Short mmCIF file of C-alpha atoms in Angstrom, two decimals:
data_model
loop_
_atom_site.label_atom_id
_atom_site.label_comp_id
_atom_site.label_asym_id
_atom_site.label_seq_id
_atom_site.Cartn_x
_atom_site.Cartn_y
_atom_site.Cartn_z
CA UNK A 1 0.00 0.00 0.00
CA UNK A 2 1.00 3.30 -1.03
CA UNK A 3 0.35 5.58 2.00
CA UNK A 4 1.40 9.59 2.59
CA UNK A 5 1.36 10.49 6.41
CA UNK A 6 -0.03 14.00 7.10
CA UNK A 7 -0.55 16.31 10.10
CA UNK A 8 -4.17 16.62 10.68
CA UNK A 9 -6.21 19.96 11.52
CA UNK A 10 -9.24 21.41 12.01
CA UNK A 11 -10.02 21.17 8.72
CA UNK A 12 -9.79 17.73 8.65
CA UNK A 13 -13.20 17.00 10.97
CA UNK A 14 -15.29 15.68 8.92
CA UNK A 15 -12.75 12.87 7.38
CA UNK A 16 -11.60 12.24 11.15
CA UNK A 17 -15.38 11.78 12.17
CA UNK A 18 -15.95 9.22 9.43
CA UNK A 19 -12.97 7.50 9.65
CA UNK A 20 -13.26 7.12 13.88
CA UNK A 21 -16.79 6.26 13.79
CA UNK A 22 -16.71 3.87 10.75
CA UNK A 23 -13.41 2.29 12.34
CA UNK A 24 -15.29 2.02 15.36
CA UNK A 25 -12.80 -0.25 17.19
CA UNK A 26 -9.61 1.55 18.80
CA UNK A 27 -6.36 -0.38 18.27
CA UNK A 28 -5.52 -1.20 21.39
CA UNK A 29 -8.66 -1.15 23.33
CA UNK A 30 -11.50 -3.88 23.09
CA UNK A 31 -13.68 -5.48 19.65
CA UNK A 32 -16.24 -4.10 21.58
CA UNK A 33 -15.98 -1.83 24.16
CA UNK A 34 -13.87 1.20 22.28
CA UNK A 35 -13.95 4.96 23.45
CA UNK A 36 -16.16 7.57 21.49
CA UNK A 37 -15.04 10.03 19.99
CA UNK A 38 -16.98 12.85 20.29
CA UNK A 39 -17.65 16.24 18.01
CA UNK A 40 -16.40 18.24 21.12
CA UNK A 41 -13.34 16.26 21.72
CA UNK A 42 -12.92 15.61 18.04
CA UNK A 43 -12.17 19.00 17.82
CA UNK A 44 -10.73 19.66 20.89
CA UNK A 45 -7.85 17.50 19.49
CA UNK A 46 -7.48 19.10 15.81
CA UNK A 47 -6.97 22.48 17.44
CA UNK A 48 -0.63 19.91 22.94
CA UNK A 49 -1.83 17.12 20.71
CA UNK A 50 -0.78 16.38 17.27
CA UNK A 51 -2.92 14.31 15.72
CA UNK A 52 -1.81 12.22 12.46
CA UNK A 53 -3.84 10.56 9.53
CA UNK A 54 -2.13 7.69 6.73
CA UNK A 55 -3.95 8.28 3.67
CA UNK A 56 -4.13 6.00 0.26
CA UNK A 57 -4.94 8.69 -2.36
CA UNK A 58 -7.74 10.56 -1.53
CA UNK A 59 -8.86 8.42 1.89
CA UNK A 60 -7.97 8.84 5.57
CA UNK A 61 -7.09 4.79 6.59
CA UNK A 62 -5.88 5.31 10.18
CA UNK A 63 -5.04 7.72 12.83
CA UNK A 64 -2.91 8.46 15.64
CA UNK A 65 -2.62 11.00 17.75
CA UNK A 66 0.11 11.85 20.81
CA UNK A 67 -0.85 13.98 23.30
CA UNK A 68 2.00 15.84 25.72
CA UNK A 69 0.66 15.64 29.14
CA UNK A 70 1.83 18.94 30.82
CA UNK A 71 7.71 18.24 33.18
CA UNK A 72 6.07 16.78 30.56
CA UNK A 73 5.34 12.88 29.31
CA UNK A 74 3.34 12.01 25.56
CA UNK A 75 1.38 9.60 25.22
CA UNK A 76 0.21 7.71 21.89
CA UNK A 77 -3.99 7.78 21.94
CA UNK A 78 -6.76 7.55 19.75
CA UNK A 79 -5.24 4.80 17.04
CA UNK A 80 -7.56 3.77 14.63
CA UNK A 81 -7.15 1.86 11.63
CA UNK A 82 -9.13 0.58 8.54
CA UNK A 83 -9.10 -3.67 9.11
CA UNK A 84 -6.56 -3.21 11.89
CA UNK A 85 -4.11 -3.72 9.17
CA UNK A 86 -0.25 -4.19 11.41
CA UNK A 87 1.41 -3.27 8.17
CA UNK A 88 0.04 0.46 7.76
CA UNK A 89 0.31 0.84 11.80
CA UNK A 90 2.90 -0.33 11.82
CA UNK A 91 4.17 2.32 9.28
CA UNK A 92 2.37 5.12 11.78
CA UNK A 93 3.66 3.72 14.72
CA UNK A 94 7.37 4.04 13.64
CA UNK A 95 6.88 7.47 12.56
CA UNK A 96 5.50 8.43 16.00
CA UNK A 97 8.78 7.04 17.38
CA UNK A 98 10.82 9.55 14.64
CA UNK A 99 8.80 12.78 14.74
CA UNK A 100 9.33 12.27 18.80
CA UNK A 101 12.90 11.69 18.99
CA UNK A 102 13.39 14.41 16.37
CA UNK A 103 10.89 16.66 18.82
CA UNK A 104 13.07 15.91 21.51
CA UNK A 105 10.73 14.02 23.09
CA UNK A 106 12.08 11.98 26.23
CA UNK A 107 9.82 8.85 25.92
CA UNK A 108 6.35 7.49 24.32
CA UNK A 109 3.91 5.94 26.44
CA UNK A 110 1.12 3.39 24.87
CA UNK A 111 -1.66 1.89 27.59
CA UNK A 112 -3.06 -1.46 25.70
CA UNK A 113 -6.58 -3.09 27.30
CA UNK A 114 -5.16 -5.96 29.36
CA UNK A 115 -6.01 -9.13 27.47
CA UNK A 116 -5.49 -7.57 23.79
CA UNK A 117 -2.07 -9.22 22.90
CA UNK A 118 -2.45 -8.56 19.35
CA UNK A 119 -1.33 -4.88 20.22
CA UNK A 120 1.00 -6.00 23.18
CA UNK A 121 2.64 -8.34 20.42
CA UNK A 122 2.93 -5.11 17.94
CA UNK A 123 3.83 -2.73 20.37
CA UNK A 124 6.92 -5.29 21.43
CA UNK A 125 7.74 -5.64 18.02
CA UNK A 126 8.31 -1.62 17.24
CA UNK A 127 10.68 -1.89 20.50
CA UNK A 128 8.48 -0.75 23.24
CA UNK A 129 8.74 -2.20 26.52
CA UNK A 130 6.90 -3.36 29.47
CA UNK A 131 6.14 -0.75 32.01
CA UNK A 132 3.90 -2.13 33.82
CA UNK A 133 0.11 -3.06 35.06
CA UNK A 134 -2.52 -0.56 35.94
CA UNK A 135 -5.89 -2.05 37.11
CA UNK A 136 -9.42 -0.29 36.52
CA UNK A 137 -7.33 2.42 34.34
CA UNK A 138 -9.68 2.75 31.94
CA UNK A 139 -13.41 3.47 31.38
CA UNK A 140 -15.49 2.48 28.50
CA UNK A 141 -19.04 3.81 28.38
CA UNK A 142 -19.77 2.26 32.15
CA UNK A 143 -17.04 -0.40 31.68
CA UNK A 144 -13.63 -1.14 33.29
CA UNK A 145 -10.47 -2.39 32.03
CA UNK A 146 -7.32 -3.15 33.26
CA UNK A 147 -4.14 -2.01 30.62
CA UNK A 148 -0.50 -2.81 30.52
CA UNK A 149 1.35 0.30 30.08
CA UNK A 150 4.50 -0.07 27.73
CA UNK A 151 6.95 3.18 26.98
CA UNK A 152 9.75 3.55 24.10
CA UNK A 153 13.00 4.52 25.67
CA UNK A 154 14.27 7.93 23.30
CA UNK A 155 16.72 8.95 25.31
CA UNK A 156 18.81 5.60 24.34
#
């Protein structure tokens, strides 16, 4: 696949809201239970967040977006992708890890739902590594889960 990766902005709503809500399923959340993204916080990340689309000529196929929590640490949220397809994340993901280090970022955090080790098994794959366990650290609609927490090491 022949993909172009491009910064998203406001002016990208209306692709990000079809690709999101057609997606449906976040990457490393669950097949069912999978955050919403709403028009509020839709926008609320197109306008520190940068928030990145792959695109096969005219279509937005996946997202990703990393968010700087302000000392400072980003995290990689809000990863969708068309089939789930490893080889175009996988494509994203590894950008992620070069537009941080050449950011100057210090590290990349990813939470993954606890029993999803398709995107444990990716994650380890791109280089990340076990941080650790978190229970209850997210909420979905009105249910828990439990996520691993893995980080990229950019200092080294």
């Amino acid at each position: 696949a022949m993909i172009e990766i491009k910064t998203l902005t406001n002016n990208d709503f209306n692709e990000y809201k079809r690709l999101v809500s057609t997606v449906n399923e976040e990457f490393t959340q669950d097949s069912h239970y999978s955050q919403t993204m709403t028009d509020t916080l839709i926008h609320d990340i197109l306008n520190k967040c940068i928030v990145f689309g792959c695109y096969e000529n005219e279509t937005l196929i996946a997202t990703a977006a990393l968010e700087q929590i302000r000392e400072h640490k980003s995290l990689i949220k809000y990863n969708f992708v068309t089939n789930n397809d490893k080889s175009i994340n996988s494509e994203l993901i590894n950008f992620i890890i070069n537009y941080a280090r050449q950011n100057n970022y210090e590290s990349l955090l990813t939470s993954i739902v606890s029993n999803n080790i398709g995107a444990k098994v990716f994650y380890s794959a791109l280089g990340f590594d076990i941080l650790g366990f978190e229970k209850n650290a997210i909420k979905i609609g009105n249910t828990y889960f439990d996520e691993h927490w893995l980080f990229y090491d950019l200092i080294n």
